Amino acid sequence: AGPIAASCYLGKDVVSSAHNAFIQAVSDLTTLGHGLNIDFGFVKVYVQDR
Amino acid sequence: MNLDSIFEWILKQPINYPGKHQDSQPRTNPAYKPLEAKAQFHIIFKATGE
Amino acid sequence: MREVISIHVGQGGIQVGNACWELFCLEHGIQPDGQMPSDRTIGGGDDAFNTFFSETGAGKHVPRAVFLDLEPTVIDEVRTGTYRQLFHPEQLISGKEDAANNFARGHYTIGKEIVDLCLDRIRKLADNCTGLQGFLVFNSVGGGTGSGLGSLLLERLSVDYGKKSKLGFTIYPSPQVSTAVVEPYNSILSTHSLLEHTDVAVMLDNEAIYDICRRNLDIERPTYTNLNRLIAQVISSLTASLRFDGALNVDITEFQTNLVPYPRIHFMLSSYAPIISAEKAYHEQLSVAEITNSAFEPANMMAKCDPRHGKYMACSMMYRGDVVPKDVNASIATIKTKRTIQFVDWCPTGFKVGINYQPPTVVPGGDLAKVMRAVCMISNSTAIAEVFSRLDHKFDLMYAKRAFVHWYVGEGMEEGEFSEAREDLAALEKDYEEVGIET
Amino acid sequence: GYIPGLKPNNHYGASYGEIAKNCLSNPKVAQNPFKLASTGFNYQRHDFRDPSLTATTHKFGAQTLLKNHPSIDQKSNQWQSQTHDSFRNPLHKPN
Amino acid sequence: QHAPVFEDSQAATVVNKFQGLRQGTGGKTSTQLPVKQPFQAPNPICGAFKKRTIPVSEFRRYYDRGDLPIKVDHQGSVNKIIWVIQPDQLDYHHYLPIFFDGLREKLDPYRFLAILGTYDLLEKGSNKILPVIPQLIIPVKTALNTRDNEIIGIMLKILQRLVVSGDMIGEALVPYYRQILPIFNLYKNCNKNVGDQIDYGQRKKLTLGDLIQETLELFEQTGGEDAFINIKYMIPTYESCVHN
Amino acid sequence: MREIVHIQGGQCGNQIGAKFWEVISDEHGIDPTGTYHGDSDLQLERINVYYNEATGGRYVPRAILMDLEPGTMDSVRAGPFGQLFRPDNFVFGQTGAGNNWAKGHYTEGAELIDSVLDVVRKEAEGCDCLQGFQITHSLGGGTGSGMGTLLISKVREEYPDRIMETFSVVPSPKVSDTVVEPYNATLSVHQLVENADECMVIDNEALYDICFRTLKLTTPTYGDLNHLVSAAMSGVTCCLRFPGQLNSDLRKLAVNLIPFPRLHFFMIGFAPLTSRGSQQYRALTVPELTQQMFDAKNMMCAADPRHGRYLTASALFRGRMSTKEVDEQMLNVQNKNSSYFVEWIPNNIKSSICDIPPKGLKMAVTFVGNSTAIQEMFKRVAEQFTAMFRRKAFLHWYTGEGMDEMEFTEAESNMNDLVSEYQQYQDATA
Amino acid sequence: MFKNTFQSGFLSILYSIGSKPLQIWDKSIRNGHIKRITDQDILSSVLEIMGTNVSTNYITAPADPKETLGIKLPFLVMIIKNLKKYYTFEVQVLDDKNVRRRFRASNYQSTTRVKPFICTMPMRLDEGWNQIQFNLSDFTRRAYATNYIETLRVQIHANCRIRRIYFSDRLYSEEELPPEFKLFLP
Numbered sequence A: 001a002g003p004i005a006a007s008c009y010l011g012k013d014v015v016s017s018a019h020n021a022f023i024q025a026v027s028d029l030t031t032l033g034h035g036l037n038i039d040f041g042f043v044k045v046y047v048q049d050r
Numbered sequence B: 001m002n003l004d005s006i007f008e009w010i011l012k013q014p015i016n017y018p019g020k021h022q023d024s025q026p027r028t029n030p031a032y033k034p035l036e037a038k039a040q041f042h043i044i045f046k047a048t049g050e
Numbered sequence C: 001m002r003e004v005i006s007i008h009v010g011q012g013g014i015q016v017g018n019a020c021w022e023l024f025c026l027e028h029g030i031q032p033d034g035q036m037p038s039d040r041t042i043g044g045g046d047d048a049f050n051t052f053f054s055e056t057g058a059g060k061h062v063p064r065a066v067f068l069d070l071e072p073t074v075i076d077e078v079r080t081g082t083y084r085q086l087f088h089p090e091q092l093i094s095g096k097e098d099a100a101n102n103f104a105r106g107h108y109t110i111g112k113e114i115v116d117l118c119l120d121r122i123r124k125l126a127d128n129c130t131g132l133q134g135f136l137v138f139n140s141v142g143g144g145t146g147s148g149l150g151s152l153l154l155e156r157l158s159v160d161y162g163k164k165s166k167l168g169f170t171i172y173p174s175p176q177v178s179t180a181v182v183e184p185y186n187s188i189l190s191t192h193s194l195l196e197h198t199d200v201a202v203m204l205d206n207e208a209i210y211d212i213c214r215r216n217l218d219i220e221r222p223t224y225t226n227l228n229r230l231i232a233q234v235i236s237s238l239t240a241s242l243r244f245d246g247a248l249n250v251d252i253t254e255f256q257t258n259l260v261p262y263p264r265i266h267f268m269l270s271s272y273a274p275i276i277s278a279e280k281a282y283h284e285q286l287s288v289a290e291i292t293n294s295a296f297e298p299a300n301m302m303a304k305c306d307p308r309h310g311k312y313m314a315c316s317m318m319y320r321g322d323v324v325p326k327d328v329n330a331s332i333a334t335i336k337t338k339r340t341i342q343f344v345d346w347c348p349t350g351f352k353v354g355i356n357y358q359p360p361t362v363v364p365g366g367d368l369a370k371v372m373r374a375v376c377m378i379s380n381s382t383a384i385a386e387v388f389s390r391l392d393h394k395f396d397l398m399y400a401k402r403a404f405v406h407w408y409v410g411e412g413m414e415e416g417e418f419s420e421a422r423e424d425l426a427a428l429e430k431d432y433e434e435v436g437i438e439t
Numbered sequence D: 001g002y003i004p005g006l007k008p009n010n011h012y013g014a015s016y017g018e019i020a021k022n023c024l025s026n027p028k029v030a031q032n033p034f035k036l037a038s039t040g041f042n043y044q045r046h047d048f049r050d051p052s053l054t055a056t057t058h059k060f061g062a063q064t065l066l067k068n069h070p071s072i073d074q075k076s077n078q079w080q081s082q083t084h085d086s087f088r089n090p091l092h093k094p095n
Numbered sequence E: 001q002h003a004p005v006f007e008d009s010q011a012a013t014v015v016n017k018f019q020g021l022r023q024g025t026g027g028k029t030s031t032q033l034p035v036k037q038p039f040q041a042p043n044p045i046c047g048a049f050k051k052r053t054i055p056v057s058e059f060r061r062y063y064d065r066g067d068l069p070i071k072v073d074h075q076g077s078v079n080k081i082i083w084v085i086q087p088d089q090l091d092y093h094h095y096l097p098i099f100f101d102g103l104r105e106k107l108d109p110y111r112f113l114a115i116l117g118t119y120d121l122l123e124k125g126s127n128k129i130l131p132v133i134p135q136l137i138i139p140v141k142t143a144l145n146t147r148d149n150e151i152i153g154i155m156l157k158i159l160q161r162l163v164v165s166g167d168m169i170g171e172a173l174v175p176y177y178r179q180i181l182p183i184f185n186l187y188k189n190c191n192k193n194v195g196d197q198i199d200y201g202q203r204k205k206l207t208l209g210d211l212i213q214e215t216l217e218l219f220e221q222t223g224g225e226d227a228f229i230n231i232k233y234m235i236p237t238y239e240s241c242v243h244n
Numbered sequence F: 001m002r003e004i005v006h007i008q009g010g011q012c013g014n015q016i017g018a019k020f021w022e023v024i025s026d027e028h029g030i031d032p033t034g035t036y037h038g039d040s041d042l043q044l045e046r047i048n049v050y051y052n053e054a055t056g057g058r059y060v061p062r063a064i065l066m067d068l069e070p071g072t073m074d075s076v077r078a079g080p081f082g083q084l085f086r087p088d089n090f091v092f093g094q095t096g097a098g099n100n101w102a103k104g105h106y107t108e109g110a111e112l113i114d115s116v117l118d119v120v121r122k123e124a125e126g127c128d129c130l131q132g133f134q135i136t137h138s139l140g141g142g143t144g145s146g147m148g149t150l151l152i153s154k155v156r157e158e159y160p161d162r163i164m165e166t167f168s169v170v171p172s173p174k175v176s177d178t179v180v181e182p183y184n185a186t187l188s189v190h191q192l193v194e195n196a197d198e199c200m201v202i203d204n205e206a207l208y209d210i211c212f213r214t215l216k217l218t219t220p221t222y223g224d225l226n227h228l229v230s231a232a233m234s235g236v237t238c239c240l241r242f243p244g245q246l247n248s249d250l251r252k253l254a255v256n257l258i259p260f261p262r263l264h265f266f267m268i269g270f271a272p273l274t275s276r277g278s279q280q281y282r283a284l285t286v287p288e289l290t291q292q293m294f295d296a297k298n299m300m301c302a303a304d305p306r307h308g309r310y311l312t313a314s315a316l317f318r319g320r321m322s323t324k325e326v327d328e329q330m331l332n333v334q335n336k337n338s339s340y341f342v343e344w345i346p347n348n349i350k351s352s353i354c355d356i357p358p359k360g361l362k363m364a365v366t367f368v369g370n371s372t373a374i375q376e377m378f379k380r381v382a383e384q385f386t387a388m389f390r391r392k393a394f395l396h397w398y399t400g401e402g403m404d405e406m407e408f409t410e411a412e413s414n415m416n417d418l419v420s421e422y423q424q425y426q427d428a429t430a
Numbered sequence G: 001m002f003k004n005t006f007q008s009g010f011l012s013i014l015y016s017i018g019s020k021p022l023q024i025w026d027k028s029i030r031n032g033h034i035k036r037i038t039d040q041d042i043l044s045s046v047l048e049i050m051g052t053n054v055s056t057n058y059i060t061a062p063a064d065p066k067e068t069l070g071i072k073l074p075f076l077v078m079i080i081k082n083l084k085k086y087y088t089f090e091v092q093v094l095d096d097k098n099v100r101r102r103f104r105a106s107n108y109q110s111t112t113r114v115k116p117f118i119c120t121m122p123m124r125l126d127e128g129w130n131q132i133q134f135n136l137s138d139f140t141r142r143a144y145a146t147n148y149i150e151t152l153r154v155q156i157h158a159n160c161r162i163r164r165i166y167f168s169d170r171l172y173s174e175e176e177l178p179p180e181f182k183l184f185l186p
């Protein structure tokens, strides 16, 4: 997360904490339904119910 | 959820996902103004995709 | 000439009866075999045991007690104990099937098959007595068997004997400590049953006794035996005024005349002092002033209630030992001058004091030490409304969703039986606040 | 500070002083069953094998537990708690 | 679609001083230092009130079949169906389950033809509707499972008409309470505490809580003696009505 | 007094029952010859709950062994402690079910069920006052899952007010040994939910996971799984057979655990479970027992408890321990995990104490908890069943002897009905 | 609060036809619901109180406690629709001595007993709409043998339909009853 913060002109610690909260998308996935399409660019990840 | 409704879901419950991402952080360069809590948290992901 | 009969119903009643009868036997010097030793006489005078025991004519003595249960495990424990020859073998009435915490089962299904034998044995015990004083009943209120059988027994003895005094010592569930999941239901049903049938009720919540054991007795993992021993000590202190001489005697019949302002209000809480371990019992004076100060401490209440949240209505004092009336009067004056405790306006004096000469009896294998002076706290206050109010909300949460109601409906009890019990609770609560307001 | 036996096998409902006395005046908590030295040579003297095993495979593989369990002494709480007089006198203290 | 430029949206009062590497909790082990709050799983909510993703209906296919005698007539103010061949001649064993399957449909005119077709079918039928009852259990559970207010609201009205249309229908429906009652429990208390002001929605019976209560009311009187205990077993909240 | 009678069916049921009876025999000090060589007097006071006295002073279990093939009972008789059983209680056919629920419920089960009803009627009538029945069977097989359910229906019809308790082995999808598991599983659940008073579900995958992780033994065999199941099931009636601070028979547990009649499916667990080499180092105390008990991996099911809310839970403690500590630990765990406990059932934990520990332990705990997480197990079973049933595969075998697809359709719909009504109470609020 | 105020023949406390039928009344609800809807039996608007847990859901005549809703009228009467379920109501009464009494009428209760504060009484409801004339004269004269001077509160619990509460002061029949107090037969 070093170079990412350098390009974003933010602290290194906050970017890592920002990653950690987003990685807790399994709780959103564990609940029923709640389909996902995580693109953020070239690769698109589609998650149906499970 | 289109990777953006996730942002509201995380921002909706500060107690479940406490951290520095919940509030805005100052930038490392005085030229750039600090961003919104939602705005600063998207711009990290665009950097990660790149 | 004076006699009382103890009726123990349910597992909790039996387990506390064991401790209290052991205490009585040790206090009166009767060996577990029932035979007083030819030598080593510990008590002077005659017929002191006559209040609690009956003389067979030649030899042993038999307690004026009867044990009731629907499940035989604890009955067999008692029957194979060290007191097998103490009790009459046919007065330990044991059932066949357990009601399984079902008040309807204990009031409509299987308690009726036994209540006939219960009343037969009760009559065979009572007709022996001539100057009978009253009945003592012990029962855990959060159990189906205890609640239902106690309700039926009080109902039957209300019409069989009428005006005779009956004392009920319930053990209410703690505000947050509990063992079952349905105790509010049968607790409310039992309160409805016994509201109009008993004369005096005593609150004996287990959480307060746990707190007393932890703070004072210095016990970190107490069990039920210690609680039963303290309850037995309280009962013995209450009953010592009957079988022992004293400067100021107090009779059971002189309770409604001093502690019951209105027929509806007869629930009250107890406390006891001193409670100290032998490791530090001999390092302080144990003066009457400090023991009566400890008695009025809100943290020493035998039930989880705060007297500071309400006004005091009546309060009865029983001192046993070498206490002096002038010292008692000085202590009463000090308590009156204290501001933290406030009484109602329509009661100028609310203290009744009893003095006894016999010091409390110590038990080997117990926890308490030997002390000259002990005071029993018996008081009626408006603060007991909170225990009724909290269980009312405990009931409503489950009752709104018809939770666990089919188990009681299928045992012959109508669905609407809960509503009138709830109405009786609501009317009782409104009575407490109505009395508590000033004029 | 650390009354020795009171933690592992929890002591029952009783005064802390009495149970401390009971677990201090009891045997063990000392003595050399293996005659081991804390310096580290009787380690090479000793064997370190527990004689509480058997074998396994092709039928059942759980094995019975170590001797850290009671036996024969199984007896109810009412038997312990309620006895009449057969104890030490609480207030004897010979003079 | 529009989305604000994320690199521009900014905050003002937050101060731009940056601590940087000049940091550290080492050597300052005070008892007032902050601790982490670890992530905890949120409260599970499941899908009790989620949508059901309504399944496909056979009525739409059977209307495209061109083998159901029914026509939309626009001569009236409200469109009224006309029977090419009178319903008395039709075989209720074959057609009646199909029309019940159309209750799920929402697209015009499949939704329109379903309710109107059913009402005429039940109203004109006299005695042959009874043997069809076993075959009607499948559609009623499917539609009620959709968990949608409009479809549930209309078809509870259908259920009320079925019981009252003829005699002896309530008695035969008693064994089949177990397959339709559980939905009634969920929406039994689904009522609004309006308070004092007038509720103008009486004209359109769209209140689910009131509809369920009256539908269960009709079940008890017509079901018979055994009807009440079956309802109380299925739903615990219920209370007797015919009994005094 | 308050005796119960054991009935085991199928190969899996007999394998469970053999180990259970061996464990009970060692618990009560009964040698494989039937002679009492015990050391404590309490070992014989309540022997009549499970054992019958015969002339000559030997004890025989009142177990009825039922199967549709004589192969497995010849094996269970020849095994250790196989001489305890009365040879007249063995009942069998000569054909077998062939993992076909229809054949084990309509064609072959009906003609053989008369003898088993006769023998169980004799056994139940002989005893003074019956308390209940217990059944051990698997839902993945033909003869068991069918004939046992038919027998439970018959026994419930003849005895309306008695307690029926059963142990279920449910086929998980990850480890599956039969290609036709969903069919008979759904068909059996349909009747089981209607008939049984109490049901307990055991998953083989959970047993293997426990054996590999907690016990950390290299090669588990079916002996170890049976041992765990037997210990867990004996922990239920330990308090009925022995005294305790808070006695609580089977009837008391049901009243406190089933709020509504159709919700009687539970998951169980036993503590402590430790590896052989790590027993010198652990200190057995109540908080340790509770924290190992409430662990998700300790449960005997693939259902994960934090995916749903505990309706009610029950803990049975074996051995002597203080009452205050148990209550404080229960309150502590209830307050610490308030999210997983439903809020309209306050104080939803039940605790009982039995003073006699199991053979080889100073303390032991059995856990029974009713959680809404079992809805996942029902959902996954139906998905496979409908997947196979949409194309009508493996259907002619069941429909060749008098069944029709309407029965399968109503069985599937009833199972979904249970799922809906069971998840309804998860999200309900005050 | 209806003290030092004139009343001769009738005095209404609640009436379902108005902009706001209840000002003085206070509503407390836990699991129930309150609304005003028209009736199919009588083509007029009627108030609705329904819900489980009969005791918790109720409405009190005075908005707040710690004051008196004093009224001298001896005869009480209500208009209630029979829903064939549980329903009950209470009234607070003052006798010659300066002490208060409670009178209770319960649908599901089957026994009666007199107490110094509460005097419960079973009651029976016929089918359809009906009016109940609560005497309040002999009730205090029979239960406590004391005259009546003043009645304080009236309380209605859940699961009932209410059209009008008023005091008749005496036994009245339909012909002398004014039309607005009359319930016109459908």
Ligand SMILES: Nc1nc2c(ncn2[C@@H]2O[C@H](COP(=O)(O)OP(=O)(O)OP(=O)(O)O)[C@@H](O)[C@H]2O)c(=O)[nH]1
Residues within 6 Å of the ligand: C009, C010, C011, C012, C015, C016, C071, C098, C099, C100, C101, C102, C140, C141, C142, C143, C144, C145, C146, C147, C171, C173, C178, C179, C180, C183, C206, C224, C225, C227, C228, F246, F247
């Ligand atoms: N103070 C005290 N209370 C006890 C004791 N044992 C049980 N209780 C209380 O009794 C309640 C339950 O009743 P049980 O002990 O099961 O006995 P029961 O009242 O006859 O009910 P049944 O089991 O149906 O026979 C528990 O909630 C405890 O609070 C005890 O030894 N001392």
Ligand SMILES: Nc1nc2c(ncn2[C@@H]2O[C@H](COP(=O)(O)OP(=O)(O)O)[C@@H](O)[C@H]2O)c(=O)[nH]1
Residues within 6 Å of the ligand: F009, F010, F011, F012, F015, F016, F097, F099, F138, F140, F141, F142, F143, F144, F145, F169, F171, F176, F177, F178, F204, F222, F223, F225, F226
């Ligand atoms: N716990 C346990 N499960 C077993 C054992 N043997 C078989 N099973 C399970 O039982 C299932 C097969 O059941 P089956 O033998 O056909 O039942 P039956 O037809 O009634 O005899 C398999 O999925 C196994 O997981 C055993 O010894 N122990």
Ligand SMILES: [Mg+2]
Residues within 6 Å of the ligand: C010, C011, C012, C143, C145
């Ligand atoms: Mg009991």
